[model samples]
Target: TAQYSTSKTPYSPQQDIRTYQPPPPGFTAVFTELVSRHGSRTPTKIDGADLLLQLWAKARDESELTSAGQDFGPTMESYRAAIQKVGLGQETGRGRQELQGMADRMQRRLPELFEKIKKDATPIAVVLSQQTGRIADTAKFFTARLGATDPALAPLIQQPVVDQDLLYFHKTERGKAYRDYLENDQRYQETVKRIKNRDGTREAATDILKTIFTPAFVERMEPSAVTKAAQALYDLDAIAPDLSVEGNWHLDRFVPRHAAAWFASIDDAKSFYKKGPGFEGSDITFAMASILLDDFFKQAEAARAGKLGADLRFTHAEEIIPLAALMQLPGSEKQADPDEDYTYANNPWRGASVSPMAANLQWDIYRNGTTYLVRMLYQEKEIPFKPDCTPFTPGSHYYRLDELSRCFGRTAR
Candidate 1:
């Protein structure tokens, strides 16, 4: 009865959203109001402008010191030429320490500098608090969107795998710390203000503001924040699947190891398709197979090296996973277990590649009118899964068209 002959269809929200609505008609009204009130909120662009100005100011001071018409202990030439030599690090410049001190002073005055640019950019604990909220909102929390044929029975039939690794939204601590720097730490606050924006108009005192407008800067800030939040969340037992023991939820302890093993399994199984019988070397399988290998390799590397923690990493990796997930041999077996569960624990390449792997875990497609699914199976939910997760089976984990939108709709783009 189905158009596709495959036993399982890979997840694709674009295809799935067409078949179901986000919520039943009755709930839509309530959900719409909530979305209007908070979900549709846009970040304050003014704060972003101020942050850009601060970065520019810092760049300016650096440029000025290098341009000053004096050089020291370098080739015999004009001041500019001599300065260039020192700038190139070939020699030391006169008043280098003094110039450095000046830069430091500017860096220290960033918050006040921002305030001068925009009075409301004031480092009120409230701004810090709100920024903290925004930061918290950006965290990688896990949720399951459910769909049922019977709209009235949907809530009862749906279940989600709550993330247990306990990655938390530590925006509060980060916010408080940032607030302390702005409100109480005079030197830090001022220095923050001194950072000029690329446009030469604002200061980079507020991270949230910078993130809203300066995409490049935001890309740099995201990963470090995610790692910190993940750690804090795990520490507080805030991660799903509820592993409350100390240090168990650490991303370092589980993420790299778990992700490495899982992706390695994907890669190993994919390799076998080349030699085995039954549609050996088919283009679709081969291409999808290659995708799996590439993504797994990438994520494996990131998991070990810690580069995946970068904010821009997610955006970049998402581009690869969709392609990678499509390349797999539809039903490859899991890889053989290694002698030690975390044997590749020390491999930096493992961490380098995991960034992309985590992004591709969703499978939301239907085959023969039954939704097909594939995802990394972890024993305990940490960053995004819960302990009570029902393994994919016909009756227990059947897919619904609407759930796809919740998991992979606008967010995928």
Candidate 2:
């Protein structure tokens, strides 16, 4: 989980394939499916960086910048230039590595499945968001690595398909209520504003301003304006690790850990309400993810029928977070009261854990004559099915496919 708004922790695959126990002796993996969030990417726009740069220019012209502020100006400029060069919202070097690494490990973990695809000439299907370039690029990088691992299997890997509704549902009809809740709901807006202006937020804003401006100058600025500017800096710093190859720059020095944490708290609050488990017993935020969940089951059925070998999908955090909530994944099931606010201390939801760069959910399907068992992997680690779904073995991640359908109330297709 991100301790601070500017936290840029590197991507680490969640499971060690070599350490996982093999499925009971009789079962053999035949199909694999995964839904992944795009890797680390540049911000969708340069507004944050531009805002900080403008503030720095104003301070320079007024001769109000401290020694540290003077040094910060050039660093911000270079970082801005680097982001522009890479194209805002595009995946970075680290992003490519994240996907390629996962593909490599998948090949290692399920060598038999890959071999089956080769021997049976079964096709591997890839689907991704057509609205975003980064997600499409993620699909290419992952599939490219899979092909690289075994050149003979290249022909079986189908070209990635663009599925706008499936991968970018936040912009589709199903997401209208969610979008309306974010834009028109008074409760959500009020709670966010209150959280943003809390005492901790004010202190962090003050601390951030003091780094570049004299106490006198800072005292003269409006608290709201200072906080907004600090947020811009936080935005820039949060994605810095993704752009590590572009340049060596740091925003943490200007924004203290406490301040960063406060900002992150605000961000987490927004995500929790908008995309995660909101008020207790409410499912509005996550219900839209049901469409994606249905598709997952359909793909599994097709794989079970020997129509496909693997199904790979690429999407965004917008969908992944809600899906995790809907599925009640670890660190995502907690719900808050409408009268209460979500805080790290009180809620289990954290963006880093819920939808970090390259975050993914995978299912490996195994068969033993007439019996079919499924194993789930979230961010690469094996995890139990949602609480209500019973596993084939107590404490085991493996489950009967039919049991999953029953638990989800889906008619077996």
Candidate 3:
């Protein structure tokens, strides 16, 4: 199936800012912590593009290309060249802006906190997963923006540190079972295969090929090969927005919106089962994220003890998706019944909402005299903790730190 590489939907805050209540009087934000997914990036490898280019070359040599197909070869060549220069898996211009803008908004939202950091020389620490360059670049971009906003705070910002356990826990020892499930589980493979062979897949494939090739040529191609090539086309289209600044590359001309959506559905279904709330009553998909949750609590405890001002981290969708599932975040709560197939209509889970580019989770800690309160912001908007936890006021976003620890089964410091 053609997976929509950049299928994530844009961030939409659930709450209206105008109706939001301010933190209680005498309670000011003191320490902040966040775990952010890196912004939009090029694919980790050029295999998909490389494959398509090979096919394009063959078609061109044979004079089998239509007018659209002729144009597509040059466009794809430009994309491939640009990607080569950009390097695989590196953040694009849009990615840099996403991280920078988030940093700018953070300072804007909590000007008082920035002032506190400047005045007290409170250190701002950054941590990143050592697994990829793009994530590290995201951290650097965010830190640079933070420093640019408040010069005095720059000196207090600590050098970014790498911690695979906290950010890339999926690759750690604890993730063995999850890795095993993905590799050996018959149900997972069968479900994915079923979705790939659906009528939608074939229809979308046919539509995509028809756009670039003569009907006669398209008809001669094997259905399976066409389907694979169509997926490659979808992959290019999905990442085009991220690479728009690089060139005038547009795959949409060949793949219509409906065709793209069909591919996106396949992608969403795979994400829902692979990294999200998998089969019902199963924790296999999200158990690895416990390490991230532990770090959240540990960092909060350290902050409470006056050990840090902020704890910032950068990671990937693989990490963020599972973390959302473990936290039971909105759009990530439903688990597909093992006997039933996962579909957008049957499940609330959506990749775009669950772990979009630049997705982030923040814990803003507030101090009222000796007491501490905490509020969470998912993708820069205030959100309540999981349902089991009670807020200070009914429907209010604020919660006591101790209450959060209790609700999450962590001991309060």
Candidate 4:
């Protein structure tokens, strides 16, 4: 048998370039002191075992061998025996019996055993390969430097070495390094600020501020002022104004004048001409109001005829009208009585009760095409109790303004 049979080839001095040196003679003494200070005292099971007896028979020749070489034979034999025990064989029968036992065990408890092996083996193999590669690299490097040298000198200190696959750590090391740079580096902070500055625009800022800040300021206005501002705001924002085309000032100038002539009564004409809040009386009032009322009348008549049309403008007109005028008229509650019903009284106001604070009835505009409708029934409530009216209850004033226009025209009766 070869002198170093089953042992690795001796390190060659001729081929490799990088060489390693052994540590100082007293290195082991220092190492022992350090480990004894910190290391656990518990004895490991494999430490006391005579692994040689577990595998190899003692060489009958009794030739003297190095302690390292002595262990080498037993270690290789143990591995070989372990392989055979785990169902390795050339032909079918011997291996088949061993494999069948394992198969039976696996079939009986597949999920429990499979999960245990997968979890345990993956980490063990990864760690073992990492450690073994590191140790082998160090040993080869030392062999190239000090082949067959004196056994008394201690091995050189191992530098912090990383296996390549483990160094990258499945790319997790690089990912963590990148994340750390972003979170901790000054250069990354500057880059982030530069990108944010480049992305922000003046128009975008204005839109955001308008939504966030403008509503509170607008809400502080008096209700009457709010009504007027809302009208102007709506006119400015509306995609389709009364004008058929853009820049046609003639539509605004001439249309209302023509409509004023069509009103059947002077009061009707005056109601049409009434100015909104802040402009008690103005030509725009006469013109806009007249046009608005005319539209209201036409729409109310159409709705009764079962044709659909717009009435939001007229609804605003009826809502902004004084509370006294709203309360003087017979409300929907009075009209719903079968004996007292009026043909024109389609819009029904159920709770037109007197408010002591306002000293006037807080009239709910009942179901009217321009003012309230069935859908608006969900909106009726005391203005003070805004949140309570989340969804409107039944018999509330949900009338449309088209119904008001009918009342204004005396057409519903």
Candidate 5:
């Protein structure tokens, strides 16, 4: 159930960047831009572990704890303490590693570009999205590694420019239509309930309860009560891997794989409806991302025509998920049909593949005389433009920059 973490799954490149094809032989890369999600982080708080601990305390008073149940409370306390020290919503240790490694690889991937930036003294754009929670420190995206990787370029890395209107569009006024859909759309509401009430959801909940509580204790609990506790357990499992640097908590022992899979499906359903492509014909989910999408193209247009450098943007899953849909990148392309709800059986969308933590979309621009070309990489893997957009040549990843503009229906600014 590693995919069970949904968007929280830590970053790993699907294809070796080393094997990527060179830019059409004679073409020279001039500029590149990236929009990356921040690395994995602690929950706003480990509310699930706290909830389970309270339940554990009450069950002990009734002497209803099973043998394995004895370990649950203390383990939860340890998790709580570790995160509390790091504070909520802050990036974890592996989170730093994810970005550091990415910076290292990106430098290695474009040694020529890095050298050009150094020789020309061109400033590489470093933009950060406004944070979601209380603390504003998003240390995971720090350019320390990028600068250190090539000390010559250190002086040219610009301070991050804050542009919430572009990157955090979902939370801004631009997202009112999307926010309205989440609350007012009957189809969205009904479909969500159907997934939550579907078979195996409750069964998994009951099986999870049986592990920690005696049979009699489990029986006396209301179905709603049982499901609530199970939800807590599922939340715990989802956050476990992100916290691995803390210690080996053995959460896999507590939440069985079979049970975790079921909850993961439930989690996937909510994510699929919220930020992913919604109903096939409706653009409600991705409508706000147009602003973000516009900026991506604008940045590339400027860099290709003006500077020869890199553009780096950092944000959250909320931003990454919608951009995935707006661009229709592979797994983010399929939308749920009206007749059937989203499910592992019916849909191709998987959060692990679509918007894992540290997920990024990169555009590499190349030039051959007056001809400009663009190649897109989703999570550092070569991906084609949406099916509507044709390549510069058949069976080629390169797309003529003007051709892309026409295919995407973008008019001159």
Candidate 6:
């Protein structure tokens, strides 16, 4: 139940890359590019967790503490200690492994590319977004893994450069309109209010409150207090799993089952509007991702034109979520109607699948003599592009370079 942290879910490869489909006859994987979200992290901010502790103290003062509530104090203190060690907005030990493993897997999957890089001195381009501290740290772990795989490829890996515009587009000057809409949209505010106060949310919040505080204490509180305390507990529960390597925490008991899922839905609701496809009539939420998509095309086209080897990018949920929607990748293609509410039953976008920690979209370019085609992988699992785009063959995952450009309305050059 705690895995429902929207974009905060930890990363795990769903399948073995070795089992991925081989390209058609004579199609050699010649070029590659990757867009990966930074790995698992401790809660970047402490407000929610801090509130959890504050509310616990209030319960203690009222003599309303349940057994679980009494145990919760030291649990949170321990959680704080471990989290502080890593610092906020920094990848945890597990997070570092996630990126390193991803790098290691890429090497295992494409031994030929590394061999070529070493033999002919092909340079590998790695870009870390400028603003996020976690992203730069993730890049360090990722590139460190790549170089560790082979000392020969170490020289090909270049010094990391900051590329703010490409990765943090939504928060930049170009995204002023989007930023305004996010902050000032009355409709969005109402929708979020409706979600938080919806029947399930209220019931779940009350249920969680009763578990930690005495029923009399919960009944004496204002309606907002119930939700505030419950939400604070939920935040701790959801983030605990990511810190498993640091400590063996059992926080799920505090806000288990129905409560966790409902809170997760609220998270989904907000992300659906802000990052995923927004109200069906407009593309403001994901429009900024167009440049990132264009960058993918640029790298693919560069490979097709024989300009370089690979471009590895480390970014955040803001980029990954929108890129998935803009590209119409599986689970991100459906958009709620302008008049309809987005529910799990109505939409396919789920933060767990769409932008989980270390979540990635990869393009591996292959060539047959003069022919080049690109194959896309979502979460390291081979998959076809959106239904409108056809493959090289009836069952092949390969798409002709020109066909992709034509279908995507982007240039090969």
Task: Score candidate 3 by lDDT.
Answer: 0.81
**CA-RMSD of model 1:** 25.7
Better TM-score candidate (3, 5): 5
Residue-level lDDT tens digits of model 5 in 1-413: 25578777878877688877678867877788888888767877577777788888989889998898888888888888988887788888767777787787788777787777777777888777764432123433447888666677778888667788777878888888899989999989999988877888777888887788887887888888889888888777787788777766777666777888888888888899998998899989987888878877787778755664888888777888988898888988889997888989988888888988788888888888877789888888988898778887887889988888888889541
**What TM-score should be assigned to candidate 2?**
0.95
Cα deviation in Å at residue 97, candidate 2?
0.7
Which consecutive 10 residues in model 2 have the weakest lDDT in total? Answer: 1-10
| TM-score (all chains, Cα) for each model | 0.18, 0.95, 0.93, 0.15, 0.95, 0.95
| Clash pairs detected, candidate 2 | none
Over 4 Å off in model 6, which ranges? 411-413
Task: Show model 1 residue runs off by greater than 4 Å.
Answer: 1-51, 55-151, 157-159, 163-413
Q: What is the lDDT of residue 97 in candidate 4?
A: 27
Question: lDDT for each of the candidates?
Answer: 0.23, 0.83, 0.81, 0.24, 0.80, 0.83
lDDT of 4 by residue, 287-399 (tens): 22233234333443444342221111101112222221222222311212222321223322221121100011112122222323212111112221122222233433323
lDDT of 3 by residue, 1-413 (tens): 11354344433344444455689889998888899988777777788888778877877777877788888888888898888888888888777887887887778767888787777777898999884488889898899998887878889999888888788888887788999999999989888788767777888887987777776777788888888888888877877777756766768888888888888888988888888999988999999999998888888767767767888999888899999899888888888998889987899887777777888998888898888888888877788888999898898899988888899888643
Tell me the lDDT of model 3 at 358: 81
Over 303-362, each residue of candidate 6 has an lDDT whose tens digit, in order, gives 755657889998888998989998888888888775788888899889999888889989
Put down candidate 2 lDDT per residue, 1-413, tens digits, no spaces. 23453214446677798877589778999999999988877878898778787877877888888888888889988988888888988988888988999999899989998989888899999998773489889998899999887998889989888786787788898899888888998887887787756777767888887787776777777877877888788777777878876766877778787777777778888778878788788788888899888888888877767979999999988888888998899988789987778988888888877788888998999989878888988888888888889889888888988899989989543
**Model 4 global lDDT (CA atoms, 0 to 1):** 0.24
Is 3 or 6 the stronger prediction by TM-score? 6
User: What are the RMSD figures for all models against the true structure?
Assistant: 25.7, 2.0, 2.7, 46.1, 2.1, 1.8
Give candidate 5 regions above 4 Å deviation. 131-142, 411-413
Which residue pairs show collisions in model 3?
A: 8-352, 9-352
The positional error of residue 406 in candidate 4, measured at the CA in angstroms, is 5.7
lDDT winner between 1 and 2, please give it: 2
